[PDB]
């Protein structure tokens, strides 16, 4: 389906101030005659890239900025071009969170960081360390309470602990990300997750605790502490708990490091209402009165709009939010963040339930988080050396032995496939009629149709990549060598998205090397 002209459909998460956002929508309707529909579907961050890919979905999508680079890389977002006068009304660091490949891909709304929320009637002074929580829980259990309950199903809430002693997602040094350097299974990450698993094993927490269970327990006065963001404060106000919002506890003397999000509004590339969306976001929502309406429903945190943020800055809950934000780090918006989050969510859940050990769980998470970059490194090098006749001299980098050995295996087995299946390869090449970067882009659909319509095994993966090499050779001979790298990226995208779970179960490219050994 096509997006309907002359209305606005907005998607925002169900924990945010969506009735507040609908009031801003009604003000827009009152001026313009244009109906604004606000929806909060489950798993909207997973649904958006599926429906938007077919030219469907909402006109405007709200999420934290971490998902938006993936969306932008897939052509799902309109470039945002506010004038200088509008850009200067928001803090520059919030604009930086919505910049992807030099282009603004969303409007920033507000800065979110988790804090420790504590019941002052149970815990007059909250604990400064994670390490004192077991003893504190023992004290509280004797009075029929617990120390701490928070969502263990979403790794956002457990990440601050994992990150504290040296866990990291993608390493940041000299003002740039080393996407090859992933810190999911180092000693720091292990120490943090082991502490969490030990809290569970000693019955200080329950592995099944989710968002709803922890909220209800805190807001009924059953647990002394929770971990949550500004959005949660509204329901706590209603409960009349005497609560404080403060700095997260330290682990091994070091601050808990929450991943900081910037709630952001992106415009769908398929929307025929882009001018209405920009008008709504700039002149209705991102105003003192627009942000107030949302903030009164569920608090936004530290708003991007300089004028309204000065008014809210005096709130000690916001001061505490920004203290934790400064100790933490701004999330990347790189396309791999979705894979990172999927990998760590599974690792926390399996470690918490005892399905896997901490070592086993973080091992798998590391492989999952590394999979795109390692797969690209191998696939791009094979395609490029096959096309040119000469290999890449560049160092292989992180997990370089695996990448080197996988490439050597792929040269052996892939050249065998190209030789033996030369007839079919030639026939399919002629059938596809590839001649430019436009035709290369259209291969993704046929590639995913043929590669996924069949069993999952290493032999079929070799075919995917070897035919890729066969096409790369053709692109070089027709003076279309600049298409080879986008082809490699497209093959890699198809492989890692469709076979993510299977690939991780095989120990990634080490499984490939082992399967075809001797």
Ligand X SMILES: CO[C@H]1/C(F)=C/C[C@H](C)[C@@H](C)S(=O)(=O)NC(=O)c2ccc3c(c2)N(C[C@@H]2CCO[C@H]21)C[C@@]1(CCCc2cc(Cl)ccc21)CO3
Ligand Y SMILES: OC[C@H]1O[C@H](O[C@H]2[C@H](O)[C@@H](O)[C@@H](O)O[C@@H]2CO)[C@H](O)[C@@H](O)[C@@H]1O
| 13 in contact with ligand Y (CB under 6 A) | yes
Q: Which residues contact 336 (CB under 8 A, 6 or more apart)?
A: 170, 179, 369, 372, 373
Q: Out of ligand Y, ligand X, none, which partner does residue 512 contact, by CB within 5 to 8 A per kind?
A: none
Using the rule CB under 6 A, which residue among 187, 313, 446, 478 binds ligand X? Answer: 446
Instruction: Determine the interface stretch with ligand X among 182-190, 293-301, 406-414, 440-448 (rule: CB under 6 A).
Output: 440-448
Distances (CA, A) of 241 to 15, 150, 204: 20, 17, 22
Using the rule CB under 6 A, which residue among 341, 451, 467, 470 binds ligand Y? Answer: 341
| 112 in contact with ligand Y (CB under 6 A) | yes
Whether residue 192 contacts residue 251, with contact meaning beta carbons closer than 8 Å, is answered with: yes
Instruction: Determine the interface stretch with ligand Y among 60-68, 200-208, 307-315, 359-367 (rule: CB under 6 A).
Output: 60-68
Q: How far apart are alpha carbons 285 and 303 in whole angstroms? A: 12
Q: Out of ligand X, ligand Y, none, which partner does residue 401 contact, by CB within 5 to 8 A per kind?
A: none
Instruction: Determine the interface stretch with ligand X among 125-133, 196-204, 224-232, 452-460 (rule: CB under 6 A).
Output: 452-460
Residues paired with 90 in a beta bridge: 305
Instruction: Determine the interface stretch with ligand X among 158-166, 258-266, 279-287, 443-451 (rule: CB under 6 A).
Output: 443-451
| 491 in contact with ligand X (CB under 6 A) | yes
Nearest residue (CB) to ligand X, 12 versus 406? 406
Q: How far apart are alpha carbons 203 and 47 in whole angstroms? A: 36
Instruction: Determine the interface stretch with ligand Y among 102-110, 154-162, 219-227, 425-433 (rule: CB under 6 A).
Output: 154-162
| 64 in contact with ligand Y (CB under 6 A) | yes
The neighbour count for residue 356, using CB atoms within 10 Å, is 18
User: Closest approach of Cβ 339 to ligand Y, in Å?
Assistant: 11
Q: How far apart are alpha carbons 223 and 216 in whole angstroms? A: 9
Nearest residue (CB) to ligand Y, 333 versus 366? 333
Instruction: Determine the interface stretch with ligand X among 248-256, 301-309, 456-464, 499-507 (rule: CB under 6 A).
Output: 456-464
In 3D, which of 452, 38, 462 has the Cα closest to residue 285? 38
Cβ-closest residue to ligand X?
A: 424
Instruction: Determine the interface stretch with ligand X among 12-20, 322-330, 459-467, 507-515 (rule: CB under 6 A).
Output: 459-467
| 66 in contact with ligand Y (CB under 6 A) | yes
Q: Out of ligand X, ligand Y, none, which partner does residue 315 contact, by CB within 5 to 8 A per kind?
A: none
Q: Which residue has the tokens 């019941």?
A: 119
Nearest residue (CB) to ligand X, 317 versus 421? 421
Helix (H) or strand (E) run with residue 111 in it? strand 107-112
| 15 in contact with ligand Y (CB under 6 A) | yes
41-44 long-range contacts, CB within 8 A, separation 24+: 41/11, 42/14, 44/11, 44/12, 44/13
Q: How far apart are alpha carbons 301 and 321 in whole angstroms? A: 7
- Tokens found for residue 221: 């006065």
Nearest residue (CB) to ligand X, 78 versus 488? 488
- Tokens found for residue 278: 């920009």
Q: Out of ligand Y, ligand X, none, which partner does residue 112 contact, by CB within 5 to 8 A per kind?
A: ligand Y
Give the angle subtended at the CA of 91 by the CAs of 88 and 95, to the nearest 5°.
90
Q: How far apart are alpha carbons 488 and 337 in whole angstroms? A: 20
Window 113-142: residues binding ligand X (CB under 6 A): none
- Tokens found for residue 424: 């079919």
User: Closest approach of Cβ 156 to ligand Y, in Å?
Assistant: 3
SS (H, E, C) 8-24: EEEECCCCCCHHHHHHH
User: Closest approach of Cβ 368 to ligand Y, in Å?
Assistant: 14
Using the rule CB under 6 A, which residue among 156, 170, 218, 512 binds ligand Y? Answer: 156
Nearest residue (CB) to ligand Y, 99 versus 252? 99
| 478 in contact with ligand X (CB under 6 A) | no
Distances (CA, A) of 121 to 158, 222, 240, 260, 334: 25, 11, 11, 29, 43
In 3D, which of 11, 98, 97, 9 has the Cα closest to residue 49? 11
Q: Out of ligand Y, ligand X, none, which partner does residue 51 contact, by CB within 5 to 8 A per kind?
A: none
Residues that bind ligand X (CB under 6 A): 417, 421, 424-425, 428, 443, 446-447, 450-451, 454, 459-460, 463-464, 467-468, 471, 487, 491
Task: Tell me which residues touch ligand Y (CB under 6 A).
Answer: 13, 15, 45, 64, 66-67, 112, 154-156, 229, 261, 341
């Amino acid at each position: 389906g096509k997006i309907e002209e002359g209305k606005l459909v907005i998607w925002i998460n169900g924990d945010k101030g969506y009735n507040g956002l609908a009031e801003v929508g009604k003000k827009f309707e009152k001026d313009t005659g244009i109906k604004v529909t606000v929806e909060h579907p489950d798993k909207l961050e997973e649904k958006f890239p599926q429906v938007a890919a077919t030219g469907d979905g909402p006109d405007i999508i709200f999420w934290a900025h971490d998902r938006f680079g993936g969306y932008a890389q897939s052509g799902l977002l309109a470039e945002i071009t506010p004038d200088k006068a509008f850009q200067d009304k928001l803090y520059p660091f919030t604009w930086d969170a919505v910049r992807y490949n030099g282009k603004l891909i969303a409007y920033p709304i507000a800065v979110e960081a988790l804090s420790l929320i504590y019941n002052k009637d149970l815990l007059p002074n909250p604990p400064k360390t994670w390490e004192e929580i077991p003893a504190l829980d023992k004290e509280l259990k004797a009075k029929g309470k617990s120390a701490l309950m928070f969502n263990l199903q979403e790794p956002y809430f457990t990440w601050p602990l994992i990150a504290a002693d040296g866990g990291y997602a993608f390493k940041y040094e000299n003002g740039k990300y080393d996407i090859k350097d992933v810190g999911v299974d180092n000693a720091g990450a292990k120490a943090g997750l082991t502490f969490l698993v030990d809290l569970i094993k000693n019955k200080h927490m329950n592995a099944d605790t989710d968002y709803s269970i922890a909220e209800a327990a805190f807001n009924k006065g059953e647990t002394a502490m929770t971990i949550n963001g500004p959005w949660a404060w509204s329901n706590i106000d209603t409960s009349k708990v005497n609560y404080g919002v403060t700095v997260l506890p330290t682990f091994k003397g070091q601050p808990s490091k929450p991943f900081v999000g910037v709630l952001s509004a992106g415009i769908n590339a398929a929307s025929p209402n882009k001018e209405l969306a920009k008008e709504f976001l700039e002149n209705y929502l991102l105003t003192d009165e627009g942000l107030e309406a949302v903030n009164k429903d569920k608090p936004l945190g530290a708003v991007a709009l300089k004028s309204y943020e000065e008014e809210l800055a005096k709130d000690p809950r916001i001061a505490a939010t920004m203290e934790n934000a400064q100790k933490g780090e701004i999330m990347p918006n790189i396309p791999q963040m979705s894979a990172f989050w999927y990998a760590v969510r599974t690792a926390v859940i399996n470690a918490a339930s005892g399905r896997q050990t901490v070592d086993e769980a973080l091992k798998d998470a590391q492989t999952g988080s590394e999979l795109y970059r390692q797969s690209l490194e191998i696939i791009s090098r094979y395609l490029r050396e096959q096309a040119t006749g000469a290999a890449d001299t560049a160092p292989m980098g992180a997990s370089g032995a695996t990448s080197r050995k996988a490439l050597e295996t792929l040269r052996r087995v892939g050249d065998g496939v190209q030789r033996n299946h030369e007839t079919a390869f030639q026939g399919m090449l002629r059938k596809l009629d590839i001649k430019n970067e436009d035709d290369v882009k259209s291969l993704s659909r046929v590639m995913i149709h043929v590669f996924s319509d069949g069993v999952t095994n290493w032999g079929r993966i070799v075919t995917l990549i070897s035919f890729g090499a066969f096409v790369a050779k053709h692109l070089k001979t027709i003076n279309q060598e600049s298409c080879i790298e986008p082809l490699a990226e497209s093959i890699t995208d198809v492989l890692v998205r469709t076979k993510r779970d299977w690939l991780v179960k095989q120990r990634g490219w080490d499984g490939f090397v082992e399967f075809f050994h001797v």
